[PDB]
Design a protein around this nucleic acid. Structure first.
Lengths: 195, 47, 49, 174
DNA sequence: CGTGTCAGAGTGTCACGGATGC
DNA sequence: GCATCCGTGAGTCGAGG
RNA sequence: CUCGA
């Protein structure tokens, strides 16, 4: 940049990838894979087949690939991340509130650095932490070591609400608790009829 | 609210869709006030 | 500052890496500020100078 | 010139390489949360960039000024806002989940109120449903129905007793 | 509020497949 | 062209902490 | 955490 900055443009972080997706011709890169797919060696063709699966979907649907890079993050309504009071006077909140709070904390600190014209080393190292915060809010633990809460317990991210036996699907959609029901010990009764 | 609707569509949420959903920006990081139990303005529980 | 959705970066296979033909580790180095990436190059100006 | 402003950014990048990674392990023991230590590091070096007095004398230990700034930030984070909230997490076990009671008692009363309401004159029924179901004022109902002020007062006075007649005749508990 | 030695985490699963990488 | 490594999965229900 | 089929 000090020498030939007039000639090229580069960037770091997530905002750079946002620029690559904009300067991207979907139809051309789709056809470029089709040429390799039409006549190619299996070693390097299978790796070209799978790319088309992703690229072709963006082309037909009419939805831009830019959605993979976020300028704004939605906040889930509060009753789905409720903060309950405890019989000891203190409080207890959902882990989603500590994740949303950490995104807000780091996003507001970045707003100060941009205003202050802080050195690029602090702004870039801050922007990195904002990426890890949104990564933790959406899927904590996916990349690297997860955000531990008090007691080295990993916080439950938004995507943790949908996975496995404790997730929303299996715990609250495939099976539910029902009214008009009970349970007790069973005792054999020979006098009863089969019905 | 009848229970017959054919398709359930999913897709990428544009950053412009996220603002279309939102009833305001969560600016401050505070939650509530720990005396009055009233949520702070522009916080994570802003009324 | 824009951020990327981890579902499409770290989720295997990397959906972003398939779109831009970038390697996963190289894509990891970019987003988390370990390496710059060239967004554009005035190739004709470089030739004329 | 332009090269003088770039020397200020090359100065900050220097103290990062010698102090940031060592300062991070200091905040990690004081808080216990790695993501919180990174927040302490950025705030500490931000004050170093705002204090030229600490970046001036290299013959004076600058690493130590950071450890005490980090100490003061963590002891301030350790005050009131952390005091109440930090304790519990709903996702964490040992916290009771919130419950809401059933609407059985409310549904039965609503059924009996709807029964006693049908046995009211169209004038009385259309006045109690505008004062208690719509919550309007005494003069608001008078303006809507095109009647006098005291007319709404008298209708409500009887219509309430008319319902008490219908409820007590069915054994509704006082 | 101001801040000028340094003090520093958990660790006994595994089968299986496929993208990831020297 | 291949060994490596990452991410996925691993019974259901009930009682007390 | 501890137990019941």
């Amino acid at each position: 940049v000090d020498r030939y900055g007039e000639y090229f443009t580069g960037a770091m972080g997530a905002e750079s990838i946002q620029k690559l997706i904009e300067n991207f011709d979907i139809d051309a890169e789709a056809e470029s894979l089709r040429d390799v797919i039409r006549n190619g060696k299996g070693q390097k063709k299978l790796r070209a087949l799978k790319r088309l699966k992703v690229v072709a979907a963006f082309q037909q649907s009419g939805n831009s690939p830019m959605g993979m890079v976020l300028d704004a993050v939605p906040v889930i309504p509060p009753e789905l991340r409720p903060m309950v009071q405890l019989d000891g006077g203190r409080f207890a909140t959902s882990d989603l509130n500590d994740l949303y709070r950490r995104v807000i904390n780091r996003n507001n600190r970045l707003k100060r650095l941009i205003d202050l014209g802080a050195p690029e080393i602090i702004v870039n190292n801050e922007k990195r932490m904002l990426q890890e915060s949104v990564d933790a809010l959406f899927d904590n633990g996916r990349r690297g070591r997860p955000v531990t809460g008090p007691g080295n317990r990993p916080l439950k991210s938004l995507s943790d609400l949908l996975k496995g036996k404790q997730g929303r699907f299996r715990q609250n959609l495939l099976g539910k608790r029902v009214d008009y029901s009970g349970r007790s010990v069973i005792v054999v009764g020979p006098q009863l009829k089969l019905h | 609210d009848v229970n017959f609707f054919d398709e359930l569509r999913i897709g990428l949420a544009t950053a412009e869709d996220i603002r279309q959903w939102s009833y305001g920006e969560v600016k401050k990081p505070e939650t509530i006030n720990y005396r009055t139990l009233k949520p702070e303005k522009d916080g994570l529980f802003c009324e | 500052a824009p951020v990327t959705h981890i579902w499409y970066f770290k989720g295997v296979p990397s959906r972003l890496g398939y779109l831009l033909d970038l390697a996963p580790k190289d894509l990891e180095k970019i987003i988390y500020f370990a390496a710059y990436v060239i967004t554009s190059v005035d190739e004709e100006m470089r030739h004329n100078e | 010139v332009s090269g003088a402003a770039a020397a200020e950014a090359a100065l900050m990048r220097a103290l990062y390489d010698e102090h940031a990674a060592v300062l991070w392990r200091y905040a990690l023991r004081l808080t216990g949360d790695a993501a919180q230590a990174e927040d302490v590091v950025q705030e500490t070096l931000l004050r170093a960039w705002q204090h030229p007095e600490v970046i001036g004398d290299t013959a004076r230990p600058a690493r130590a000024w950071l450890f005490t700034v980090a100490r003061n930030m963590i002891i301030d984070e350790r005050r009131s806002a952390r005091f109440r909230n930090v304790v519990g997490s709903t996702d964490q076990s040992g916290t009771p989940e919130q419950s809401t009671p059933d609407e059985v008692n409310a549904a039965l009363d609503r059924l009996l109120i709807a029964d006693a309401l049908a046995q009211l004159s169209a004038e009385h029924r259309a006045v109690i449903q505008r004062s208690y179901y719509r919550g309007w004022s005494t003069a608001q109902i008078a303006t809507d129905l095109g009647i006098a002020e005291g007319t709404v007062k008298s209708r409500l006075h009887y219509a309430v007793r008319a319902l008490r007649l219908t409820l007590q005749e069915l054994g509704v508990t006082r």
